[PDB]
Amino acid sequence: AAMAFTLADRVTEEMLADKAALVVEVVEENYHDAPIVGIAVVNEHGRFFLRPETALADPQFVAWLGDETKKKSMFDSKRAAVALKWKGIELCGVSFDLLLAAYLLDPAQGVDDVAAAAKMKQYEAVRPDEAVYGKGAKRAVPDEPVLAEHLVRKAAAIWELERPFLDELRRNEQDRLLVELEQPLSSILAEMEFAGVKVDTKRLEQMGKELAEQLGTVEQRIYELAGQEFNINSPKQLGVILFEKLQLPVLKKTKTGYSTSADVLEKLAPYHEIVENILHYRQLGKLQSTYIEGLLKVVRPDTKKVHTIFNQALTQTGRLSSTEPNLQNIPIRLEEGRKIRQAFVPSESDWLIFAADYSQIELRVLAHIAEDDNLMEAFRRDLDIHTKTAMDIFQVSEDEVTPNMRRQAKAVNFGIVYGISDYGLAQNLNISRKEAAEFIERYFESFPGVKRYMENIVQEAKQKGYVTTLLHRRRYLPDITSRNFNVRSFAERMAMNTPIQGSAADIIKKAMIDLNARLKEERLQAHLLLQVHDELILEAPKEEMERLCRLVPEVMEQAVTLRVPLKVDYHYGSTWYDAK
DNA sequence: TGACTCGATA
DNA sequence: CTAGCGAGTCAGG
Ligand SMILES: OC[C@H]1O[C@@](CO)(O[C@H]2O[C@H](CO)[C@@H](O)[C@H](O)[C@H]2O)[C@@H](O)[C@@H]1O
Numbered sequence: 001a002a003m004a005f006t007l008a009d010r011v012t013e014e015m016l017a018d019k020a021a022l023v024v025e026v027v028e029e030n031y032h033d034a035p036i037v038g039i040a041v042v043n044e045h046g047r048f049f050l051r052p053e054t055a056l057a058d059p060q061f062v063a064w065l066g067d068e069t070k071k072k073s074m075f076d077s078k079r080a081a082v083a084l085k086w087k088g089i090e091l092c093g094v095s096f097d098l099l100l101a102a103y104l105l106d107p108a109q110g111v112d113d114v115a116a117a118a119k120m121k122q123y124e125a126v127r128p129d130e131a132v133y134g135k136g137a138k139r140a141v142p143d144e145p146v147l148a149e150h151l152v153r154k155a156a157a158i159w160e161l162e163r164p165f166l167d168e169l170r171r172n173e174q175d176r177l178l179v180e181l182e183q184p185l186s187s188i189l190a191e192m193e194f195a196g197v198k199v200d201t202k203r204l205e206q207m208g209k210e211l212a213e214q215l216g217t218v219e220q221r222i223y224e225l226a227g228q229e230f231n232i233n234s235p236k237q238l239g240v241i242l243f244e245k246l247q248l249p250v251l252k253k254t255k256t257g258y259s260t261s262a263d264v265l266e267k268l269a270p271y272h273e274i275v276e277n278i279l280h281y282r283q284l285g286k287l288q289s290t291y292i293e294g295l296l297k298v299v300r301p302d303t304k305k306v307h308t309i310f311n312q313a314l315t316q317t318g319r320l321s322s323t324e325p326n327l328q329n330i331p332i333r334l335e336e337g338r339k340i341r342q343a344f345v346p347s348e349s350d351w352l353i354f355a356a357d358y359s360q361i362e363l364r365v366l367a368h369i370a371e372d373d374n375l376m377e378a379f380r381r382d383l384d385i386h387t388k389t390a391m392d393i394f395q396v397s398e399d400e401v402t403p404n405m406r407r408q409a410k411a412v413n414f415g416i417v418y419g420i421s422d423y424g425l426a427q428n429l430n431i432s433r434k435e436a437a438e439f440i441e442r443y444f445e446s447f448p449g450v451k452r453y454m455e456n457i458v459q460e461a462k463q464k465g466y467v468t469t470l471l472h473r474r475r476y477l478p479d480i481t482s483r484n485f486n487v488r489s490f491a492e493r494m495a496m497n498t499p500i501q502g503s504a505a506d507i508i509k510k511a512m513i514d515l516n517a518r519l520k521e522e523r524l525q526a527h528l529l530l531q532v533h534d535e536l537i538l539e540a541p542k543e544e545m546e547r548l549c550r551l552v553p554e555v556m557e558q559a560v561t562l563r564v565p566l567k568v569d570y571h572y573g574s575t576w577y578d579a580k
Numbered sequence: 581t582g583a584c585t586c587g588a589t590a
Numbered sequence: 591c592t593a594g595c596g597a598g599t600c601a602g603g
C-alpha cells in the first residue's frame with residue numbers, strides 16, 4: 001500500500017512545526033559540497049516532500065532549519081549538516097539521530113541506512129537505499145515519484161521509531177550516551193570535516209618526483225639481483241623469484257601461495273641482498289601509491305584542502321574511522337614517510353598546528369578498571385610503564401633493565417591490552433609459545449588485579465552477553481559461548497580489549513565536547529581539525545599557542561576522573577610534522 | 581567487481 | 591594478540 005503525502009510546490013506553516021522527522025537527502029557517498037536531491041518532513045500535521053530548490057530558497061524554511069527550538073529527528077544528521085554548511089545554511093535542533101541510536105544499541109548490525117535501523121524493530125515499510133539508488137556504477141537518483149515516496153517513507157520510519165529506540169537506549173543506560181555524547185560530537189565532527197586541512201600540494205608533488213626516482217633505482221637493483229624483470233608488486237610473481245629462482249627458505253605460507261609479508265622478509269634478509277631491496281621498494285611504493293597519489297587525488301583544486309569524513313557509526317569499539325582521505329593512518333614511525341606530514345599546514349597566515357596526545361591512555365584505563373594496585377601505583381608515579389613491566393616480569397632493578405628487556409615487556413603490554421595470547425605474543429616476539437606463556441604467567445603474578453579483571457570480564461561477557469565501556473557503550477559477544485576454540489578465543493580477546501579501547505574512545509570524545517565549549521567561552525579562534533584515537537590536532541593563530549598549551553591538556557586530562565591521573569603531552573609547529 | 585595479501589595508524 | 595582504510599594484483603562469477 002502506497003504512503004500518502006503532499007508533494008509541495010511551496011513551503012507552508014504546517015511544515016514548520018516544532019517537532020518533526022526531517023530528511024535532507026544527499027545521495028553522493030562523499031557529501032562534501034554535494035547536491036541535496038530532496039527533502040521530506042513528517043510531523044503532527046502530515047507528510048510532505050519539498051524540492052530542494054524550493055525549500056532551500058525559502059526564508060521561512062531556512063530559518064526553521066536553524067532554529068534550535070524547532071526539534072528534528074533524523075538519520076545521519078552530520079551528512080545533512082555538512083551538505084548544508086557548504087550551502088551556507090545552518091542546521092540546529094537535531095534532538096534524535098537514528099543512525100547513532102542504532103549504532104549504540106548494536107554496532108555489529110552494521111546499520112547504514114534507515115531500512116536497516118527500522119528492521120531492528122520489525123518495521124519494514126521502507127526500502128533500503130541501495131535498492132532505490134542502485135549499487136555504484138548503476139547508482140543514480142530515480143525520478144521524482146520514486147524519490148519522493150522513498151524520502152517520505154524514511155521520514156515516516158524515523159517518526160515512528162524514535163520512541164522505541166529511545167526507550168531501549170534508556171533501558172541500556174545509554175540515553176545520556178546518545179544525547180550528551182554522540183549527538184553533540186556529531187556537530188563537532190561536522191565542523192571539523194567542513195573546515196578541512198590545508199595541504200601544501202607543491203611539496204607533495206615534489207616528494208612524488210623524488211620517490212619516483214628512488215623507486216626506479218631500487219626497482220632496477222632488484223631486477224639485477226634477481227637476474228630478470230618481473231612485477232615486484234605481485235606477491236605471486238615475487239614468491240616465484242624468491243622461493244623458486246633464488247631458493248630462499250619458505251618459513252610461512254599464506255593460503256593461496258607463498259607468504260611475502262614484511263615479517264617473513266625480515267627473516268630472509270640474511271640469505272640474499274635482494275630481500276632488503278624488496279622491503280625498501282615496498283616502503284617507497286606504499287608512500288607513493290597510497291599517500292602521495294591518494295592525497296593529491298582528493299585535495300580540492302581550489303582551496304587545496306582535504307575534507308575527510310569521520311564515520312561515527314562504524315567501529316565495533318566506539319572509535320571513529322576516517323575516509324577519503326583517511327587522516328588517521330598518515331605515516332609517522334619511519335622518517336621517510338613521516339615527512340609526508342610536512343605537507344599538512346595551517347589554513348591561514350601566521351597560524352600554527354597544535355597537537356595534544358594522551359600518554360598511555362589504554363593502560364591507564366586498564367589500571368582504573370582492574371583496580372590493580374601495582375599498575376595504579378606505577379601511573380601515580382608516572383613511571384615508564386614498559387620499563388616498569390620489565391622490572392616486574394624479569395625480576396630486575398631499573399638499572400638492570402636492558403633495551404631488549406624493555407622491548408619484550410612492551411610487546412607484553414600490547415598483548416595485555418589486545419587480549420593476551422601465548423600464540424599471538426610468540427608470533428610478535430618471534431619466540432616459542434611456551435616462552436611467551438612464561439612471560440604472561442610472570443605478568444599476571446606481578447599484576448594480579450589485571451589477571452582477575454581478564455578472568456572476570458570474560459565471565460561477565462558470557463553471563464550478560466555483552467561487555468561495556470565507562471560511558472555505557474556496549475558490544476555483544478555471541479561467540480563467547482562457541483565450542484570452537486579459535487572462535488571463542490577471539491571473542492574472549494574482544495571482551496578483554498573492548499572495555500579498554502572503547503573507554504579510551506569515550507574519554508577523548510567527551511574531551512572534544514568539553515574542549516569546544518571552552519574554546520567558545522574564551523572566544524579563541526583555535527579550532528579542531530582532526531582526532532586520531534588518543535590525540536587531538538588543532539590549528540590556531542600563533543598568538544594563541546601559549547593559551548592552548550595550558551587549556552587543551554587540562555581539558556583532556558579532566559574529561560573524566562579515574563583512579564589514576566590522565567596525562568597529556570603537546571607540541572606545536574608550522575606543519576603537522578613539526579608539531580612534535 | 582570482489583576475494584586476497586599487503587601495510588599504514590593508534 | 592585490538593581497531594581501522596585502502597592500494598595492488600588476481601581470478602572465479
Ligand atoms: O555519512 C557517513 C555515514 O554514512 C554511512 C551510511 O549510512 O556510510 C556512507 O558514507 C561513507 C562516507 O562517504 C562511506 O565510507 C560509506 O561507504 C557510505 O556507505 C555510515 O557508515 C556513516 O556513518
Ligand SMILES: [Mg+2]
Pocket residue numbers: 357358359360534
Ligand atoms: Mg600517545
